[PDB]
Design a protein that fits this description.
Layout: H1 16-23
The chain binds zinc ion.
Length: 29
């Protein structure tokens, strides 16, 4: 529900710091 790294079952309260986190899930490529 809401926004949150769809890759890992975590929880966040924003889209900025939340996006930067998912940025490490797709290193390069
Ligand atoms: Zn994640």
């Amino acid at each position: 529900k809401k926004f949150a790294c769809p890759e890992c079952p975590k929880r966040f309260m924003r889209s900025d710091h939340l996006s930067k986190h998912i940025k490490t899930h797709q290193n390069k490529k």
